[PDB]
């Protein structure tokens, strides 16, 4: 629950930009919460992570 790609389109919204620097709410493909984003140049993700 609250992670994955089998999503329910009962409540439909539009995709927004991943804005950095500001305190926002987020709904990142299931993951919900509040916080601040910051774009980084990461190299530790595989094709399945």
Ligand X SMILES: *[C@@H]1O[C@H](CO)[C@@H](O)[C@H](O)[C@H]1NC(C)=O
Contacting range for ligand X; rule: CB under 6 A; set: 4-12, 19-27, 38-46: 19-27
The answer to the question of residue 7 lying near ligand X (CB under 6 A) is no
Per CB under 6 A, contacts with ligand X among 21-40 are 21-23
Rounded least distance, CB 24 to ligand X, Å? 9
28-37: burial string, b at 16+ Cβ within 10 Å, e else: eeeeeeeeee
Question: Cα–Cα distance between 24 and 44 in angstroms, integer?
Answer: 25
Q: Give residues in contact with ligand X (CB under 6 A).
A: 21-23
């Amino acid at each position: 629950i609250n992670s994955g790609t089998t999503c329910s389109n009962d409540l439909l919204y539009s995709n927004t930009e991943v804005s950095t620097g500001v305190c926002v709410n987020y709904d990142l493909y299931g993951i919900t919460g509040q916080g601040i984003f910051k774009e980084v140049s990461a190299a530790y993700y595989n094709n399945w992570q």
